[PDB]
Amino acid sequence: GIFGAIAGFIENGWEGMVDGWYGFRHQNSEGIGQAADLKSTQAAIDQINGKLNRLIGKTNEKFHQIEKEFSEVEGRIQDLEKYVEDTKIDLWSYNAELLVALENQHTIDLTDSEMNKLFEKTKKQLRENAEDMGNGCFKIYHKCDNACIGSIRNGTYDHDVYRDEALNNRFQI
Amino acid sequence: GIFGAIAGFIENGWEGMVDGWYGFRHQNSEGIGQAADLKSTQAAIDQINGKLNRLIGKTNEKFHQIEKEFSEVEGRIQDLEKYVEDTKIDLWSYNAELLVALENQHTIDLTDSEMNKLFEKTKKQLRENAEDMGNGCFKIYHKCDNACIGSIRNGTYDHDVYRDEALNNRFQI
Amino acid sequence: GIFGAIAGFIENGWEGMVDGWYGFRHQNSEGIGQAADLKSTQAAIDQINGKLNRLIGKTNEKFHQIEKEFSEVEGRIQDLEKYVEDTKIDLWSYNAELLVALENQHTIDLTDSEMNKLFEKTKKQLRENAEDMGNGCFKIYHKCDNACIGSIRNGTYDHDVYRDEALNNRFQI
Amino acid sequence: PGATLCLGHHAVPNGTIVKTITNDQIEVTNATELVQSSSTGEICDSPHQILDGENCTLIDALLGDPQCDGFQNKKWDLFVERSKAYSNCYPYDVPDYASLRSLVASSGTLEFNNESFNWTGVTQNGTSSACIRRSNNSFFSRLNWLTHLKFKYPALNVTMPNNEKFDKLYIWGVHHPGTDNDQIFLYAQASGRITVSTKRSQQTVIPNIGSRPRVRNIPSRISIYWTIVKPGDILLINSTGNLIAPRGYFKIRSGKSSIMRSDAPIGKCNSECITPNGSIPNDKPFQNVNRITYGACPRYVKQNTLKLATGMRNVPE
Amino acid sequence: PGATLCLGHHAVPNGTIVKTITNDQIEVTNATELVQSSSTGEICDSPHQILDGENCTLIDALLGDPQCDGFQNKKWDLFVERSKAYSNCYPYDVPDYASLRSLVASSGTLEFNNESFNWTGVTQNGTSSACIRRSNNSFFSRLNWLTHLKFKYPALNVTMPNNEKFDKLYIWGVHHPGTDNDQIFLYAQASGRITVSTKRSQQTVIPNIGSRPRVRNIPSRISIYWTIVKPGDILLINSTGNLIAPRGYFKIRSGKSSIMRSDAPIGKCNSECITPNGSIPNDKPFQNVNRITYGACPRYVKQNTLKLATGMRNVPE
Amino acid sequence: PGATLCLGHHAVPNGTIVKTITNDQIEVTNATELVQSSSTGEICDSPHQILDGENCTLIDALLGDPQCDGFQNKKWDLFVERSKAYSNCYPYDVPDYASLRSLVASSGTLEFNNESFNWTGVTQNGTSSACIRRSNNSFFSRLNWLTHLKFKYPALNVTMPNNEKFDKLYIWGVHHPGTDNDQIFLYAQASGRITVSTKRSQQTVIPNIGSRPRVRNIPSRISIYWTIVKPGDILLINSTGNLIAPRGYFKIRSGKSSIMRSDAPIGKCNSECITPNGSIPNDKPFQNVNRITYGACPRYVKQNTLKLATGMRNVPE
Ligand SMILES: *[C@@H]1O[C@H](CO)[C@@H](O[C@@H]2O[C@H](CO)[C@@H](O[C@@H]3O[C@H](CO[C@H]4O[C@H](CO)[C@@H](O)[C@H](O)[C@@H]4O)[C@@H](O)[C@H](O[C@H]4O[C@H](CO)[C@@H](O)[C@H](O)[C@@H]4O)[C@@H]3O)[C@H](O)[C@H]2NC(C)=O)[C@H](O)[C@H]1NC(C)=O
Ligand SMILES: *[C@@H]1O[C@H](CO)[C@@H](O[C@@H]2O[C@H](CO)[C@@H](O[C@@H]3O[C@H](CO[C@H]4O[C@H](CO)[C@@H](O)[C@H](O)[C@@H]4O)[C@@H](O)[C@H](O[C@H]4O[C@H](CO)[C@@H](O)[C@H](O)[C@@H]4O)[C@@H]3O)[C@H](O)[C@H]2NC(C)=O)[C@H](O)[C@H]1NC(C)=O
Ligand SMILES: *[C@@H]1O[C@H](CO)[C@@H](O[C@@H]2O[C@H](CO)[C@@H](O[C@@H]3O[C@H](CO[C@H]4O[C@H](CO)[C@@H](O)[C@H](O)[C@@H]4O)[C@@H](O)[C@H](O[C@H]4O[C@H](CO)[C@@H](O)[C@H](O)[C@@H]4O)[C@@H]3O)[C@H](O)[C@H]2NC(C)=O)[C@H](O)[C@H]1NC(C)=O
Ligand SMILES: *[C@@H]1O[C@H](CO)[C@@H](O[C@@H]2O[C@H](CO)[C@@H](O[C@@H]3O[C@H](CO)[C@@H](O)[C@H](O)[C@@H]3O)[C@H](O)[C@H]2NC(C)=O)[C@H](O)[C@H]1NC(C)=O
Ligand SMILES: *[C@@H]1O[C@H](CO)[C@@H](O[C@@H]2O[C@H](CO)[C@@H](O[C@@H]3O[C@H](CO)[C@@H](O)[C@H](O)[C@@H]3O)[C@H](O)[C@H]2NC(C)=O)[C@H](O)[C@H]1NC(C)=O
Ligand SMILES: *[C@@H]1O[C@H](CO)[C@@H](O[C@@H]2O[C@H](CO)[C@@H](O[C@@H]3O[C@H](CO)[C@@H](O)[C@H](O)[C@@H]3O)[C@H](O)[C@H]2NC(C)=O)[C@H](O)[C@H]1NC(C)=O
Ligand SMILES: *[C@@H]1O[C@H](CO)[C@@H](O[C@@H]2O[C@H](CO)[C@@H](O)[C@H](O)[C@H]2NC(C)=O)[C@H](O)[C@H]1NC(C)=O
Ligand SMILES: *[C@@H]1O[C@H](CO)[C@@H](O[C@@H]2O[C@H](CO)[C@@H](O)[C@H](O)[C@H]2NC(C)=O)[C@H](O)[C@H]1NC(C)=O
Ligand SMILES: *[C@@H]1O[C@H](CO)[C@@H](O[C@@H]2O[C@H](CO)[C@@H](O)[C@H](O)[C@H]2NC(C)=O)[C@H](O)[C@H]1NC(C)=O
Ligand SMILES: *[C@@H]1O[C@H](CO)[C@@H](O)[C@H](O)[C@H]1NC(C)=O
Ligand SMILES: *[C@@H]1O[C@H](CO)[C@@H](O)[C@H](O)[C@H]1NC(C)=O
Ligand SMILES: *[C@@H]1O[C@H](CO)[C@@H](O)[C@H](O)[C@H]1NC(C)=O
Ligand SMILES: *[C@@H]1O[C@H](CO)[C@@H](O)[C@H](O)[C@H]1NC(C)=O
Ligand SMILES: *[C@@H]1O[C@H](CO)[C@@H](O)[C@H](O)[C@H]1NC(C)=O
Ligand SMILES: *[C@@H]1O[C@H](CO)[C@@H](O)[C@H](O)[C@H]1NC(C)=O
Ligand SMILES: *[C@@H]1O[C@H](CO)[C@@H](O)[C@H](O)[C@H]1NC(C)=O
Ligand SMILES: *[C@@H]1O[C@H](CO)[C@@H](O)[C@H](O)[C@H]1NC(C)=O
Ligand SMILES: *[C@@H]1O[C@H](CO)[C@@H](O)[C@H](O)[C@H]1NC(C)=O
Ligand SMILES: *[C@@H]1O[C@H](CO)[C@@H](O)[C@H](O)[C@H]1NC(C)=O
Ligand SMILES: *[C@@H]1O[C@H](CO)[C@@H](O)[C@H](O)[C@H]1NC(C)=O
Ligand SMILES: *[C@@H]1O[C@H](CO)[C@@H](O)[C@H](O)[C@H]1NC(C)=O
Ligand SMILES: *[C@@H]1O[C@H](CO)[C@@H](O)[C@H](O)[C@H]1NC(C)=O
């Protein structure tokens, strides 16, 4: 949420996008389409796997320790045994609570960042051939068939080709 | 500070805005005004209250523990009692120092983010009818009375209505 | 990486910029040049020194403690001495691992933020006299000699002076 | 002409300084204190059952020192020991005093059932001029000083079975006389040996005649020992003299109970957290009042203040 | 006409709730559990060498209680003690039982070399009706009950040098007879005194004749003691009666070994982490199954679930 | 024509790898080491008062073993014990050796005031061939070996009041003779009993005659005990033989002092942090040199390196 894209200017997610995390929907002369962006999707997934690598399968070996259950009252030495273990458990419990809450805040923010970066990259690509509608969508001011939309998704869109057509449509009365 | 709005491109805060955290000042034909944005303000406040919920009123019950002050020299067992408590206190003190410093860095950044998001939302709304002056202010290139300014604050501004007037004023010699 | 500038839309760093962390390269009528931005550079450096202040030279005094190596088998009391120290060391080791990983994530992100802020400030300054090429570079649509480029680096560029010339070059066929 | 629309944020004239990851001093609009650093000075009597020890250590009340007779059968969440407290009965020591103190404190009751021990062959209810109860000579209310009957002290071999559902805690002792004469006077033979035993445990004690420096003018001593007897087990006291016998047993429970050294007055008030300096509020997550706490308390830290920002960075005009 | 190009992100119909710094309930597309909270119920026999104690405490196997003869010279990574276990030899106690238990457990072996102790002047291999081995009267397999030879018990003064590269662990004891008659019957004099010593240490023990409540109908007791003898040091047993002597020594090692109280069945399976409730997987970093663990285990925490988000915020249509 | 203006950041040819939340290997322009992992090998003599034990344990210097006479009345912040150290006086043991060691170490002084004890009736200043001082037979400098005067050892009952503002620490002992003959030779009766006492405490010790394996050809032993006497309290030694009496008391303080086992040479240098491997710099917050530290030291962690990024991500051409 800290970048303002997911649960911000993008009103909601798309349940019907099942082949990626981030993507493009278009409307043009040939119809209405959808496609996933692999690079954004992989960038977020790699970062989350990076967190998982640090947390999954990284446990520590302990062997002989101290007694932690007692069948007799004993006083001093048992108080101290109980206290040490209770102390240890509270500090680890604190560590686990804080870890999850920080990682979760950060995961939510990195996923929002990846969305914002894809929106910004796309906005620059379109140069003066489109305007931002404020809800994640661009109004493209020229004829843009499936190969054209394809060229925007693929990073090959040549903005000079449509610039004349777009400027004219943009600044008409 | 990480978004660059508060203590960045917004030169300073407004002491005379006492009804919100974020807001709008305008100059138009009818005079010079100010109004708070409730939604931004509430977004930041809710997040800070979220932190407070996790920290205020969440204490833990302890009962019988160990002795932590001693009237006699004893050696081994007392060294170990003293050491355990000193160990516990340093780790909790470390936890408290780190918590406050991280939360504070994050609060400063989320508040800056909320400001940046309100600026970005407003910039998109204005489309081609205004330019960013670089200090948080927009030059609006059309007559914009109090109802017009009101419509921008309220998210109801229709940019198509003023587009002709604005493009003409914007690209004049 | 979270802002998308360093290792994002800026393709790579400049090894030949040795007098600052962030800066400007230009091409104009008088040739091809480079200059560091001191303010950005200092902003990032100050923040990193802030972290270092909290970590370097802030150690704690301990004196008489407990025994941590033993020449004889003893059972109960030695188990508890060993356990307490092993417990302490794992929690400090955890603290050190987490600290470094969080600080490092944050340093990488603040450095990226400082780059993004300098790019955004510059983009606003140029108003309608330039367009973003999507790779950290602006195409400036007017004659801009060394004093002009200098005025952009120094925050003194007057965009109204070149506006006529630039709008005309921008919206030509 | 057109218009101008500026976006901004508030600021205040009275900022506060907070610490961050990158900067030890940055001004924010508002902040809240996370370290509780004060008390009213009073131990609140609710919601925990407070038992003010006054003149008595817990042990003195356990044994039945005569100024502690008000404490018979009482219960507590927190027993509070005062520093002015003093003993005024027969001078004693307890090997592992701290462990007996701890386990009674933690059990949280002084409930005592008497038992009919078969002490045929001796004189019960021995008294002394160092343990005064209503101007008469007396003794520890829960202990039984056995002396000779007709200058004869036969070998004791007394049994007491635990047929109950709960543990019984037995408190007993050994007299160490001041002189050889006193050993003959009281017990009619040379120093005995005590042996208290169960199916799982045995404690044998040797009395040691001799002078110790006088405490309240008394150079003899009693050494206090204890024994926990489980369900289906049996107490067995073997002795040829010097036995300070139990009159019965204490119930031993588990629970929330404990003990604290403090000189704070007890108030009529409600407070979940108790320290030796008084009760403290528990809204905050940390405190630097005392490392010794009882109840639902903030965690003790070395810092005396920790400011959490509850507002944005303050940037004045 | 032109075109429209919208940027977006996915969402799912089945979101999960996670906690964050700013909000205790936010829905994400996906999450993974970080607290392991279940077991199959079985202690896996690999990859650690598990030794099922069955009817025997570790100590009973150490001493050589007759139902524990299968345990002679065995090794273990983890020795597992069962709650049903019981002793069925001569009734005994060990002062500091927990310390002997701990150090044997941690050494991880019961390997025993016999030694030829010079017991000329007494009758070795004493037996009893409370310690049955194949219907005959018998004794602790690793101990040696010495009685009189021809109503004479001469003063013992037996030496055993450690000329080895390793420590030797000696287990020995003291008989406390039930009556004065039994003391004369077995040892031909009034109660002795034992003194086991080395160059760095000495342990003197006083036998104490008397009745204890009967355990398996036996009112006498043996008190078990131990002695570690280093390389170039010498064991020295001094006695005038009541010695329960060692037949030899245990090797004492260091290593990974320990002991755990559990009633879980042993399975034919592979699992690095063992708790008293059974083995648990160790993929997760935390667990709330048991604070007592052995092996490569997740760390014990009070929480029963901790959800780590592995996806973005879920924002449905 | 116009112009081009590019924004960028620096990079370096020699990047370093750091760890992050999302990636265990990312290259940054620069980094600083947070784990101190080396020492020069020397214990710096400043700014702490270092006392090199050399051939003497702290205890040997406390007692007054003759090679430790240079250590009389000395003070220390850190006492350093060497592994080559050895005792060369009368063979002794201390029950709870570690506790006496610890409390002396922590007090940080060996300051000793002599006192005039009333030893009328016995021969003071006993000597031995196992405790040599300048080729003569001698004894522990701070202890007093009492033997018979004219084949008579009367019952001792000597008092020493603490009228001071501070605690007094008394060190004393019990001779355990090798044979019954030696017990008569030295003390003119069968084995005594010692009883050192105060108003709050009593320690009775039984001497035990017998042979122990010879240490420096001596089969007898002394067992060392200690007693703290508070202001307004009184020391009281009761004995019928076998007393190794104090010549006086040690002042006991509190402070910064301690003790460390090390074989590092002492250097002429300044360093706040000491480990057994030598002094270490304390610029860094963590270290993996030794878990045993003294002074203002980095905290011990298991990792041998931890790289903190002090620069941006390095992205080469
Ligand atoms: C600077 O930042 C802080 C923290 O963000 C703000 O302080 C909080 O302000 C709110 C509103 O003023 C306070 O809310 C009130 O809490 C009372 C309980 O107070 C006691 O108990 C709590 C712990 O449970 C302690 O933290 C506290 O010290 C007290 O001991 C309630 O009784 C109040 O109820 C009143 O209003 C409600 C309206 O819903 C009515 O129902 C009631 O009848 C009653 O009239 C109220 O809810 C909150 O306590 C403050 N928190 C802290 C931690 O101090 C500051 O407002 C802010 N400063 C500025 C200038 O903005
Ligand atoms: C929601 O979020 C979670 C976490 O991001 C995702 O779950 C992970 O999904 C991947 C892919 O499905 C899983 O990868 C597989 O791991 C198996 C090992 O599983 C065991 O061991 C691990 C610990 O080592 C435990 O975490 C786990 O519980 C099991 O006990 C491998 O055996 C699998 O191998 C298969 O595929 C490879 C292809 O490379 C082949 O080589 C093999 O032959 C085999 O067929 C595989 O690698 C991973 O285990 C999951 N992690 C966790 C923590 O659960 C979910 O996918 C995600 N949900 C959605 C809907 O996106
Ligand atoms: C990579 O990143 C690191 C950390 O950001 C940088 O290293 C720091 O660099 C600065 C400047 O070069 C160093 O500052 C100097 O500190 C000296 C003290 O050094 C000792 O003591 C400290 C602890 O107190 C230890 O950390 C250190 O290891 C030494 O034991 C001062 O004596 C220096 O003073 C000199 O300059 C001043 C100018 O103001 C004069 O007054 C003096 O007379 C004197 O000439 C100086 O202040 C700092 O020590 C470094 N820190 C660390 C942790 O190493 C690297 O610069 C950076 N690399 C690159 C290529 O950028
Ligand atoms: C061993 O020596 C000690 C110390 O001298 C003996 O104890 C002392 O005994 C006398 C009495 O016998 C005590 O005198 C007291 O004097 C006051 C005067 O105010 C008087 O009120 C008392 O009635 C009493 O007579 C003296 O205080 C006491 N001192 C201590 C420290 O106990 C001890 O008796 C000797 N041991 C043996 C076995 O005799
Ligand atoms: C001190 O008193 C105890 C308790 O009375 C004595 O122990 C008791 O001794 C008798 C036998 O002498 C035990 O009786 C038993 O009865 C059962 C009947 O089921 C029988 O099967 C046995 O053969 C046995 O005779 C009694 O149980 C036993 N009780 C305990 C608790 O041990 C003890 O002997 C006395 N001490 C001395 C020195 O005499
Ligand atoms: C119990 O048995 C031990 C072990 O046999 C007896 O101690 C031993 O006593 C003899 C002398 O009586 C020691 O012999 C020594 O021989 C060396 C030859 O190098 C000589 O230089 C010495 O002067 C000495 O005579 C022998 O080492 C010693 N062994 C030990 C381990 O102490 C002990 O005396 C017996 N107990 C009783 C009460 O007799
Ligand atoms: C609470 O009471 C404790 C009493 O132990 C105070 O801590 C002691 O304060 C004295 C004098 O201020 C110091 O000399 C000691 O170092 C402290 N003692 C210990 C054992 O740490 C404490 O100041 C009191 N706190 C409040 C808030 O009243
Ligand atoms: C694992 O076994 C332990 C046995 O100690 C269980 O913890 C006990 O559970 C009982 C009843 O549920 C409680 O009354 C006790 O408070 C617990 N004992 C202790 C000492 O904490 C635990 O529930 C088991 N866990 C699993 C997952 O099976
Ligand atoms: C500092 O000294 C200690 C000595 O205890 C070293 O740690 C031991 O190193 C040996 C051999 O390298 C290992 O077998 C032991 O496991 C270590 N002992 C203990 C008790 O942990 C340590 O390597 C030295 N460090 C430096 C930097 O010199
Ligand atoms: C875009 O790239 C994909 C490669 O998977 C290809 O299928 C598609 O035809 C490309 N289209 C254009 C217009 O570049
Ligand atoms: C904006 O909304 C507020 C609702 O509080 C209202 O007072 C105002 O008249 C609205 N103005 C316009 C122009 O929509
Ligand atoms: C920019 O500022 C620097 C100050 O260091 C100066 O050298 C340069 O001449 C300035 N140029 C312009 C055009 O302002
Ligand atoms: C600032 O002043 C107000 C009004 O007197 C006060 O209530 C508030 O708590 C103060 N805030 C800070 C941060 O000092
Ligand atoms: C407590 O003892 C003091 C004298 O030591 C006395 O003044 C006070 O009245 C006593 N109070 C009780 C309840 O015994
Ligand atoms: C124990 O009591 C019995 C029976 O009265 C007696 O024979 C024996 O001597 C007593 N033993 C001791 C040590 O008191
Ligand atoms: C949602 O449903 C799928 C398909 O049944 C399931 O495998 C997946 O784990 C579920 N995800 C969540 C987060 O509940
Ligand atoms: C263990 O003892 C029980 C009776 O207590 C018996 O049923 C079982 O057969 C015994 N097993 C072994 C191996 O001794
Ligand atoms: C030790 O053994 C020796 C030699 O047999 C003997 O003289 C002495 O009395 C014994 N001492 C004890 C305490 O058993
Ligand atoms: C890179 O090289 C310079 C110059 O030799 C050196 O001083 C610096 O510390 C090096 N930096 C890194 C990060 O290796
Ligand atoms: C320490 O003792 C050794 C022999 O053990 C000797 O070589 C050295 O000179 C002695 N030094 C001192 C100061 O006693
Ligand atoms: C005992 O030893 C000291 C020190 O050597 C000496 O000065 C003192 O006079 C001796 N005392 C007696 C009574 O012999
Ligand atoms: C203690 O000293 C007194 C007086 O000399 C004497 O009567 C008594 O027997 C001594 N007791 C012991 C145990 O030494």
Numbering used by the authors:
A (entry chain B), B (entry chain B), C (entry chain B): 1 to 173
D (entry chain A), E (entry chain A), F (entry chain A): 9 to 325
Question: Can I see the authors' text?
Answer:
The majority of human antibodies against influenza virus that are elicited by natural infection or vaccination target the globular head domain of the hemagglutinin (HA) glycoprotein. Subsequently, we focused on A/Brisbane/10/2007 (Bris07), a WHO-recommended H3N2 vaccine strain from 2008 to 2010 and a commonly employed model strain for experimental studies. Here, we structurally characterize an egg-adaptive substitution, namely L194P, in H3N2 virus hemagglutinin. Our results reveal that the L194P substitution substantially increases the flexibility of an epitope region that is commonly targeted by antibodies.
To minimize any possible experimental bias, we obtained another X-ray structure for Bris07 L194 that was crystallized in the same precipitant condition as Bris07 P194 and diffracted to a similar resolution (2.35 Å) to that of Bris07 P194. While the overall average B-value of Cα atoms in Bris07 P194 (58 Å2) was slightly lower than that of Bris07 L194 (64 Å2), the 190-helix (residues 188 to 197) in Bris07 P194 was notably higher (142 Å2) than that of Bris07 L194 (109 Å2). This difference could be visualized by comparing the electron density in the 2Fo-Fc maps, which was much weaker for the 190 helix of Bris07 P194 compared to that of Bris07 L194. Of note, on average, the B-values of Cα atoms in Bris07 P194 (mean ± s.d. = 58 ± 24 Å2) are lower than that of Bris07 L194 (mean ± s.d. = 64 ± 24 Å2). Except for a slight displacement (less than 1.0 Å) of the 190-helix and the 130-loop, the backbone conformations of Bris07 P194 and L194 are almost identical. The Kd of C05 IgG for Bris07 L194 was around 3 nM, but for Bris07 P194 was much weaker at >5 μM, as measured by a biolayer interferometry binding assay.
